[PDB]
């Protein structure tokens, strides 16, 4: 149809909203390990 949709773009989307899911799970993750660790020893 060539209408438009370069599934590219579409293809494109999902990495990036993959990408934003990965680092938004890891900086909870490091977070709480490292709040356990009462590493926030910085809270000047």
């Not at 209408?3 to 990495?15: F, G, I, K, P």
């Not at 990408?19 to 490091?30: G, N, Q, R």
């Amino acid at each position: 149809g060539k209408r438009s949709w370069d599934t590219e773009s579409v293809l494109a989307m999902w990495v990036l909203a993959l990408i934003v899911i990965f680092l938004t799970i890891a900086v909870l993750l490091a977070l709480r390990f490292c709040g356990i660790y009462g590493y926030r020893l910085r809270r000047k």
